[PDB]
Design a protein around this nucleic acid. Structure first.
Lengths: 91, 127, 200, 97, 108, 63, 25, 231
RNA sequence: GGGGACGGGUGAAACAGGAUGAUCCCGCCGAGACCGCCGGCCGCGCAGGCGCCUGCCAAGACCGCCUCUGUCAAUCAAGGGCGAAGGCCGGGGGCUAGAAGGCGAUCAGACACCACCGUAUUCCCGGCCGUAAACGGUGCCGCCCCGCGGCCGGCGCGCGCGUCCCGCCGGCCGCCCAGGGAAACCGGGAGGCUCCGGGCUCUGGGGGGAGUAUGGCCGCAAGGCUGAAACUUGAAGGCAUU
RNA sequence: AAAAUGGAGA
């Protein structure tokens, strides 16, 4: 196994073309794009990206409006708790 | 029946400011500084500076009806200095020779609960 | 089709006729199929609700803010973009808003918006790569692809035109009050070049 | 500490029926002592179990969270959304009150 | 040619410490190499204590007593004469000299 | 504003780094007994009447 | 700090050789 | 002794000004805090509004005449919530121990205990009471330093949180000001903590209001002169 | 919101702040770091390292024991796992300091020192780097010691019961007796050793050249890791006395 | 505040 030793395996599908910076950046983003994250309600890692932004989990049969390349984009993940902070403070 | 207001006095390595204000401090009785009296940059925060700045304005606070004052001496504080400035106590001395009367004195130095990076580099200042 | 940003269909009970009216909202990240967005003056700050910006507290993350009251959606709609209420000032019933670009503007408190960042973030980080991804991307937008640079075109067409050696021929900075045909270079540049990053 | 310890204590000595449907059947006849439901419970189970529990007086309290985590707590890889406890092996101190 | 056994530090059973910067130098110094003299001083100067005490509008008032730590850097300490380099015999004397139990920043 | 008469209760020490200055401990000859060290140049002896002062300037004993 | 300003000088000498060795070949 | 601006012209910016009397809650027997100035209303500013929401600092000695030993350390910040009869009526906002006493508490040879507790006032003013205490040497301890054992320190942090919970868990701000002014609660903490281990200066460094409810009109009346109904 | 001309900065000065009202004085707030005094011949940990409050998870060492196991032991090439800062690779973040870069002010130059900005960085996540005066400049596991005191961990000892004493101590140590050392000094060793032989890994052989050249390996790169010679020339160095 | 040299070889 380990057919291509270099870590550029998902993006080995490109070959010699497209530079060395773009191929590496793509490897991280592409792997995140097809990754199975865990849908909140299903709590099972069955989610994929239907199209950029909307992701759905086969088991939970629910569509979560997540990020383009990951179920939970890093900035929103924080905003989540900041709304919770203001709200818990309000009452 | 009496009246008192807080002095909120500040000391400085560059220049001291004496800003007698009232209760909350939102409303300012009088503002004075040592630069406004002297004419040399080094003596703007000097020991003579404060003594000259008070008393010149003490009359305006007496006219404004605040005979009694509460001195809250403040050194630069925060990241640097911590201790009082050169011309700090001098200001109280000149106003105390004047009729102003002090009920309580407090330190308002903005001491920090785990401070931000101290200014200057790791070698400090190689003057 | 055109907007990378997700569009979310949400239906509300119509106040008059029994049938429910369906309204399309720019999707805020965290919206789930079956989420009940409670929307109104007394609606909470849970992510997804539509409420008067003045009632929203300071520092909140907001998307789809309205420029003037009841403009039905105006600022902060782009993928991954957000606005922050710096302060709900009551001095003139005007809430401060920090726009995604970072200017400081103000909106009447009666403006309304959705708490939560617009979904679809990180869209431009991935290189488009193959130009074909660009032909397909702009296949849902304007016919603005592919672009031909000014020094390439023959002189009868572009002001930058072409000399013997493909030289712009003059300075790109062109005044703000120039005739429509003239403004082809950088419009009214206040400082050209790359300086101390972009932060001062 | 005690709540997690109780979960391991129930797995070795107590009778634990994992799974939502089994819980309903146990509660209906009144063969129920406690119900621990994870946060990722569908709202319908949360409302329907609340009605069912109120009639049978069966005390129910939420788990710390993650149906997957309740699964890890009862020693099972499979997710457990709600775990009925019958004949608790060694005390029910965890139940609120 | 090791100068001091302590090596200017009290570090025992340790490897690294926190850094506190000199009030004068601004030089970062590990807690171990910093002078750390603790000083207690009255907020007003002693000279005008009498007139301010004379203005005792509130009953039984006392002077504001300030508790602070002074931590000069090694180079800051010698030039501001907080401490003085001493001989081999004087090196082990573990006490500050000139008695002075008097309570003020200036020893007076 | 008038130079205040003072009583040189005692002479302290010679300083200023050239020994020229001789700061002395003083008391008010006219006043509510204010007494403070003042900076003096030239020869001074105890019980001298110094009528050349504005009073506000204050000197110190550290040297 | 002569040692630092010798070592890093040596590194600058080492780098010069690399370009000279490859470009010439 | 009377409003300064009413009779005295004052400086050109201060030529138009006002002076309104501020009155403390009944718990501070010296109700008068003095007079605070504002602009006479010209329609730009409501004279009442600036007075309605401003916080004025009063040390316990000024707030009530009493022993200096228990007055200088305790500072009370009072924020008004209502303006009646052209007078500022103050309401509880916060307390602070002066940097003087907090500095005195710090000593080498002991490790401080600091615990932050949250109190849900029956009134709706979530109040955060911060408690500090210190260690002191045993009377006949052979060693000079009294650093407590870890087991006691874990117990100490738990101990201070309890008692604070019993005394303040179910008490309104009218009860609270009296329990902080009397120092009765600070003492109650000392009795329970003292048995566990020797500890010194078991005082609340500061208590500040995280959130107070809208419409504290009833409280303002209760604080100002309704002591007749409650103790 | 108030009020009223200066404010910054220093070794003096100036660079940029400010009647669109600065500095200042209070309230209200928004992020981002940081956890103050307490804070130590304290403690912890394989070391690098370790300091907000609440909890939660897996431990570690320790001492005590009429608890089994029964030599399972020591040091260890090859092989791994970590490893401060800075650096790098993509994101996120950006409060202060601030490599660069700009200024002013210094000096015959000021490239700098110093003021004032300020980007990378610093903070977090996912990887690479794999080095430091990483130092106790002292590898590890053993044994025998010369006394006097601390600090921390248990655990006993009698005592009018007091953190009282006194040991067992495991670790933190200070001074030091012989002994050793070119000395400085060490002496819970750097001693027991020219009367020179517990065990076991590592390293050195005049000062340069040289960590260079050349191969291999590693890293994305920076760099790491391994590692000669040709030639030079008489000292280089160590601790101490005036 | 500045503040730079000191030929060789007894």
């Amino acid at each position: 196994m380990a057919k291509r030793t270099k870590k550029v395996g998902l993006t080995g599908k490109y070959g010699t073309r497209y530079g060395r910076a773009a191929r590496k950046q793509l490897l991280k983003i592409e792997t995140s794009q097809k990754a199975k994250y865990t849908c909140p309600f299903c709590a099972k890692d069955k989610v994929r990206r239907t199209a950029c932004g909307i992701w759905t989990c086969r088991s939970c049969s629910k569509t979560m409006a997540g990020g383009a390349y990951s179920l939970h984009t890093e900035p929103a993940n924080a905003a989540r708790a900041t709304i919770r902070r203001l709200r818990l403070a309000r009452e | 029946s009496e009246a008192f207001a807080v002095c909120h006095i500040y000391a400085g390595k560059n220049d001291t400011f004496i800003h007698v204000t009232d209760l909350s401090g939102r409303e300012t009785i009088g503002r004075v500084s040592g630069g406004m009296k002297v004419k040399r940059h080094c003596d703007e925060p000097s020991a003579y500076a404060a003594m000259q700045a008070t008393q010149d304005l003490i009359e305006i606070i007496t006219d404004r009806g605040i005979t009694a004052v509460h001195i809250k001496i403040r050194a630069d504080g925060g990241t640097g200095k911590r201790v009082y400035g050169g011309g700090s106590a001098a200001g109280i001395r000149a106003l105390v020779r004047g009729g102003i009367k002090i009920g309580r004195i407090e330190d308002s130095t903005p001491i920090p609960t785990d401070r931000t990076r101290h200014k200057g580099g790791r070698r400090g200042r190689r003057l | 089709r055109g907007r990378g940003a997700p569009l979310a269909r949400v239906q509300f009970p119509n106040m008059r006729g029994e049938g429910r009216v369906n309204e399309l909202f720019i999707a805020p990240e965290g919206m789930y199929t079956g989420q009940e967005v409670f929307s109104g003056n007394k609606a909470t700050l849970h992510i997804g609700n539509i409420l008067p910006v003045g009632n929203i507290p300071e520092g909140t993350y907001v998307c789809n803010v309205e420029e003037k009251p009841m403009d039905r959606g105006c600022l902060a709609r782009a993928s991954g973009t957000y606005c922050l209420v710096v302060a709900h000032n009551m001095e003139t019933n005007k809430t401060r808003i920090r726009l995604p670009s970072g200017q400081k503007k103000l909106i009447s408190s009666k403006a309304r918006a959705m708490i939560g960042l617009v979904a679809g973030g990180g869209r431009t980080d991935k290189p488009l790569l193959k130009a074909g991804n660009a032909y397909h991307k702009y296949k849902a937008k304007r016919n603005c692809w592919p672009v031909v640079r000014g020094v390439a075109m023959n002189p009868v067409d572009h002001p930058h035109g072409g000399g013997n050696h493909q030289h712009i021929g003059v300075s790109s900075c062109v005044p703000r009050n120039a005739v429509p045909g003239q403004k082809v270079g950088l419009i009214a540049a206040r400082r050209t070049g790359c300086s101390g990053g972009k932060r001062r | 500490d005690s709540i997690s310890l109780t979960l391991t204590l129930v797995v070795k000595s107590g009778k634990y029926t994992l799974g939502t449907d089994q819980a309903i059947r146990n509660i209906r006849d009144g063969k129920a002592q406690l119900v621990f439901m994870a946060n990722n419970c569908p709202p319908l189970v949360k409302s329907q179990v609340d009605y069912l529990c109120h009639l049978s007086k069966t005390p129910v309290r939420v788990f710390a969270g993650s149906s997957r985590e309740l699964g890890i707590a009862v020693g099972r890889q499979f997710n457990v959304s709600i775990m009925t406890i019958l004949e608790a092996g060694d005390a029910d101190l965890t139940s609120i009150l | 040619p090791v100068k001091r056994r302590n090596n200017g530090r009290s570090k025992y059973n340790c490897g690294h410490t926190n850094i506190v910067r000199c009030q004068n130098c601004h030089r970062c110094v590990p807690k171990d190499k910093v002078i750390k003299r603790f000083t207690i001083r009255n907020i007003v100067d002693n000279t005008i204590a009498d007139d301010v005490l004379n203005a005792c509008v509130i009953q039984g008032f006392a002077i504001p007593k300030l508790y602070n730590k002074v931590q000069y850097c090694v180079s800051c300490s010698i030039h501001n004469h907080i401490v003085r380099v001493r001989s081999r015999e004087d090196r082990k004397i573990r006490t500050p000299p000139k008695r002075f139990p008097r309570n003020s920043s200036q020893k007076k | 504003p008038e130079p205040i008469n003072a009583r040189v209760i005692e002479v302290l020490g010679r300083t200023s780094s050239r020994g020229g200055i001789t700061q002395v401990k003083v008391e008010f000859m006219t006043g509510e007994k204010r007494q403070i060290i003042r900076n003096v140049i030239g020869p001074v002896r105890k019980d001298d009447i110094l009528v050349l002062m504005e009073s506000e300037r204050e000197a110190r004993r550290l040297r | 700090m002569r040692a630092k300003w010798a070592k890093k000088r040596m590194r600058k000498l080492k780098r010069k050789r690399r370009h000279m060795k490859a470009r010439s070949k | 002794g009377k409003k300064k601006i009413t009779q005295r012209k004052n400086p050109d910016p201060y030529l138009k000004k006002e002076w309104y009397p501020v009155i403390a809650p009944a718990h501070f027997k010296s109700r008068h805090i003095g007079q605070t100035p504002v602009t006479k209303t010209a329609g730009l500013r409501v004279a009442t509004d600036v007075i309605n929401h401003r916080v004025y600092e009063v040390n316990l000695g000024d707030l009530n005449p009493g022993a200096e030993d228990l007055n200088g350390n305790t500072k009370f910040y009072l924020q008004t919530q209502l303006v009646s009869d052209g007078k500022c009526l103050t309401n509880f906002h916060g307390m602070d121990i002066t940097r003087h006493k907090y500095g005195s508490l710090f000593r080498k040879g002991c490790d401080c205990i600091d615990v932050f507790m949250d109190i849900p006032t029956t009134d709706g003013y979530l109040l955060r009471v911060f408690v500090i205490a210190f260690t002191d040497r045993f009377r006949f301890q052979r060693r000079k330093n009294c650093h407590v054992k870890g087991r006691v320190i874990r117990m100490m942090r738990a101990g201070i949180y309890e008692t604070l919970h019993n005394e303040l868990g179910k008490v309104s701000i009218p009860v609270l000001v009296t329990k902080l002014s009397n120092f009765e609660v600070n003492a109650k903490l000392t009795e329970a903590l003292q048995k566990i281990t020797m500890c010194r200066d078991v005082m609340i460094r500061r208590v500040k209001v995280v959130k107070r409810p809208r419409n504290t009109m009833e409280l303002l009346s209760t604080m100002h002169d309704s002591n007749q109904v409650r103790n």
